[PDB]
Amino acid sequence: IGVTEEQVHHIVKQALQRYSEDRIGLADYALESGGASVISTRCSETYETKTAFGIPLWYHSQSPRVILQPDVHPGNCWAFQGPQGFAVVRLSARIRPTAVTLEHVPKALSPNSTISSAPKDFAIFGFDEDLQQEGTLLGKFTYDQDGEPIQTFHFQAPTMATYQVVELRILTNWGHPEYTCIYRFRVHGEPAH
Amino acid sequence: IGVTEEQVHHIVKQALQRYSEDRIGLADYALESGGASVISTRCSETYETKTAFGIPLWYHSQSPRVILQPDVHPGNCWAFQGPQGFAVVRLSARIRPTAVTLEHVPKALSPNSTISSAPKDFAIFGFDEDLQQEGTLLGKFTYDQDGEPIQTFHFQAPTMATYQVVELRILTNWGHPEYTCIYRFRVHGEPAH
Amino acid sequence: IGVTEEQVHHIVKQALQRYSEDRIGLADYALESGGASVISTRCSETYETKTAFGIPLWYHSQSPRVILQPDVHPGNCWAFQGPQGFAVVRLSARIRPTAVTLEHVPKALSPNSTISSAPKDFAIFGFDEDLQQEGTLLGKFTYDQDGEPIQTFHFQAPTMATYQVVELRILTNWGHPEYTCIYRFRVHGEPAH
């Protein structure tokens, strides 16, 4: 069949253009750089007593705001106790949610190739309210510890109801004892206009 | 004609090497990481009262320094009032300016594919002075809202006069009512040696 | 022989997957995001009196912690006096060190294509101690100012002794008068399990 050396370059330029549109090419309404985390969020656990060794004077602790942050190097996730937890996000716009993305650090950059602190089963809720009127289940999915670090999850047959407040509820993790860790959560959709 | 699978890899390695040299492969003398923004700069507008809702305690406001910062995610630009504004930059070296680069967030990551807060017409001035002796017009161009997010603009027939202080003057925007937004401005050239 | 347009895409997706696993695909136990710099480290030099011009109020000075930070834009390295210096790092885990990586800014982004502040000859030491019991030489190498910005250096025939504290000792630089500059140092290995 056969590809030409210039078709090759156009394939590369195209792939790098996409790679550089936040990788997946979809607007993120949960990106803190636009708008952000409430804190009807789970407690928050430090994934380490290398601390005991111990509080470096410049050191702090990942707030849940970290999940709305694109920085995803091995340090940078938000951890909560056990395999169940939640974060509530106030989006930068009122949108009709069509998808979400979750990512975790690559297996390659992890001790022993284990991402056992990775979220597994999770769900998304719409809170029609700028408040806590018990949320509407938007969808339920499973973060796959194989498959790629970045996974996008599209709502099966969503209404065109709009929300500006959603919940990330995690239900199971990939088996880690103490804690689960969230690197970055994103929300995609169609703006109320 | 035909490409081999190994010629393909060399094309990719080469493209990724370039992609990783700040994408365009040219030194940026306006990169704050080397040297920085004065503030014979326009006022500065907050692109939002999602604030009214309202001052998150960790929250701040984009200084004009943001245009000298490589971080270009949807949040991260500097906004000023209306379609006209300016920023004055003190470069990390005395150089002979041969080009500038401007970028804006990809259409793909923007609400409705609109980058209407994007700069349109703009100009560059040399201030021979570490002061305000009325600037020398270096060049005039137009940021294209199609065409790619990163655009480089080479001076038509520049002198080899050297400057360490330049002005970014924006003249028109792509039609946004309240404000224009600058993601990143860069200055390329030949060092006085 | 001949490549197909879809084999081309799989080559690109694969290359971008690797590019995005911190480029080299190996865990970094010296990444501050996991665990960090002691300060049986060399003094620390400011690579500039553009300062005299002078202390911008937001301005600070690169701590040696910067070498454990993935941010490698032209500003972001750690400088010490003359061509000889050292930094001591406490890894995020006790590992058996099999390699190290050093990087410097691309020639392309440097004034005149000179990376003369680049480290040249260097060595790595294991301190079996969470203390200063004179270190065990792990290996000796040379950062090549051609060859690529990111260079990885594998230990010739390492024992399976484990350490959580290593020293980066630099011996020669690429010829710069005042100072040498370190962008990022990484430590790879097999965890004590």
DSSP per residue over B120-178, as a string? -EEEEEE-SSSS-S--EEEEEEE--SSS-SEEEEE-SS-----EEEEEEEE--BSS-SS
Residue B86 phi, psi (nearest 5): -160, 155
Query: In whole angstroms, what is the distance from residue C32 CA to residue A148 CA?
Result: 24
Q: List phi, psi (to 5°) of A135.
A: -80, 155
Selection from A16, B18, A22 nearest residue C12 by Cα: A16
* Bridge pairing between strands C163-170 and C85-103: antiparallel
Distance from CA of A176 to the nearest CA of B (A): 31
C interface toward A at CB cutoff 8 Å?
Answer: 2-5, 8-9, 12-13, 16-17, 19-22, 25-28, 31-36, 63, 65, 70, 92-93, 130, 191, 193
Selecting from C9, C26, C31 the residue whose C-beta is nearest the C-beta of A11 gives: C9
Mutate to test the interface with B, among A16, A23, A89 (most CBs of B within 10 A): A16
Distance CA C125, CA C112 (A): 34
β-pair partners for B125: B137, B167
Q: Do A22 and B76 touch (CB under 8 A)?
A: no
At C121 the three-state DSSP class reads strand
Check B8 against A8: CB less than 8 A apart.
Answer: yes
Residues 6+ apart with CB under 8 A from B59: none
Q: Please state, in angstroms and as integers, the Cα–Cα distance from residue B189 to each residue in A143, B91, B132, C89, following that order.
A: 48, 11, 22, 38
Contacts of A75 (CB under 8 A, 6+ apart): C31, C32, C33, C34
Helix (H, G, I), strand (E, B) or coil at B20: helix
CB under 8 Å to C166, separation ≥6 — which residues?
C30, C88, C89, C91, C97, C124, C125, C126, C127, C138, C187
- Token pair for C54: 């002078």
Rounded to whole angstroms, the Cα distance separating B124 from B137 reads: 6
Q: What is the DSSP letter of C174?
A: S
DSSP assignment string, B111-134? GGG--TTSB-EEEEEE-SSSS-S-
Q: How far apart are CA C105 and CA C181, in angstroms?
A: 10
The neighbour count for residue A39, using CB atoms within 10 Å, is 11
Is the CB of C4 less than 8 angstroms away from the CB of A7? no
**Rounded Cα–Cα distance for residues B190 and B98 (Å):** 7
3-class DSSP assignment, residue A45: coil
- Report long-range pairs for C56-62 (Cβ below 8 Å, ≥24 apart): C56/B36, C58/B63, C58/B65
> Do the beta carbons of residue A151 and residue A120 sit within 8 Å?
no
| Cβ atoms of B127 and B66 closer than 8 Å | no
Q: What is the 3-state secondary structure (H, E, C) of A58-119?
A: CCCCCCHHHHHCCCCCCCCCEEEECCCEEEEEEEEEEEEEEEEEEECCCHHHCHHHCCCCCE
> Which of B3, B28, B130 is the closest to C3 by Cβ?
B3
Method: X-ray
Report DSSP state, residue C190.
E
Which contiguous run of DSSP H or E holds residue B13?
helix B5-20
C-chain residues near A15 (CB < 8 A): 9, 12-13, 16
d(CA C77, CA C168): 14
Q: Which of A59, A107, A46 is nearest to C90 (CA)?
A: A59
In Å, how far is C6's CA from the nearest CA of chain A?
A: 9
Residue appearing with tokens 């111990």:
A54
Q: B187 and B34 in contact (C-beta within 8 Å)? A: no
* Helix-helix angle B5-20:A5-20, to 10 degrees: 40
Burial track C149-165 (b if 16+ CB lie within 10 A, e otherwise): bbbebebeebeeebbbb
Q: Which residue of chain A is at minimal alpha-carbon distance from C131?
A: A53
In chain B, the domains with their CATH numbers are: 1-193 (2.60.120.260)
What's the token pair of residue A14? 């195209």
Distances from the Cα of A191 to the Cα of A185, B87, B111, B118, C188, angstroms: 18, 32, 7, 20, 45
Q: How far apart are CA C102 and CA C153, in angstroms?
A: 8
The CA distance from B5 to the nearest CA of chain C, in Å, is 6
A15 closest CB neighbour out of C5, C12, C35? C12
Burial class (CB in 10 A: 0-12, 13-18, 19+), C43: exposed
- The answer to whether residues A171 and A124 touch, using CB atoms and an 8 Å cutoff, is no
A56 CA to chain C: closest CA distance, Å?
Answer: 9
Asked if C34's CB is within 8 angstroms of A11's CB, the reply is no
Could you tell me how many CB contacts below 8 A there are between chain A and chain B? Answer: 71
Amino acid code (one letter) for C174: W
User: Who's near A176: CB < 8 A, 6+ residues apart?
Assistant: A83, A116, A117
Note whether C4 contacts A1, CB cutoff 8 Å: yes
| Counts of helices then strands in chain A (DSSP H, E) | 1, 8
Q: Cα–Cα distance between A172 and A163 in angstroms, integer?
A: 25
Q: Are residues A75 and C32, on separate chains, in Cβ contact within 8 Å? A: yes
C25 token code pair: 């695909």
What residue type is assigned to position A48 of the chain? E
User: Which residue from B minimizes the CA distance to A130?
Assistant: B53
What's the token pair of residue C66? 């910067």
Q: In units of Å, what resolution does this entry have?
A: 2.4
* The token pair that represents C45 in the structure block: 């030099």
Could you give the CA distance from residue A187 to residue A91 in angstroms, rounded to a whole number?
A: 8
B86 contacts B168 by C-beta, under 8 angstroms? yes
Q: Cβ-count burial of C62 within 10 angstroms (0-12 exposed, 13-18 middle, 19+ buried)?
A: buried
Residue B66 sits at φ, ψ, to 5 deg, of: -65, -35
Q: Can you give B67-85 as a three-state secondary structure string?
A: HHCCCCCCCCCEEEECCCE
B109, A27: Cβ pair inside 8 Å? yes
- Which among A74, A104, A111 has a CA at the least distance from the CA of A170? A104
**In this structure, which amino acid lies at residue B89?**
V
> Residues B165, B89: contact at Cβ < 8 Å?
yes
Give yes or no for a contact between A73 and C31, defined as CB atoms under 8 angstroms apart. Answer: yes
CA distance B7 to chain C (A): 10
Distance separating alpha carbons of residues A13 and B15, to the nearest angstrom: 8
Cα B46 from Cα B126, distance rounded (Å)? 29
Name residue, tokens 């206009």: A193
CA distance A103 to chain C (A): 13
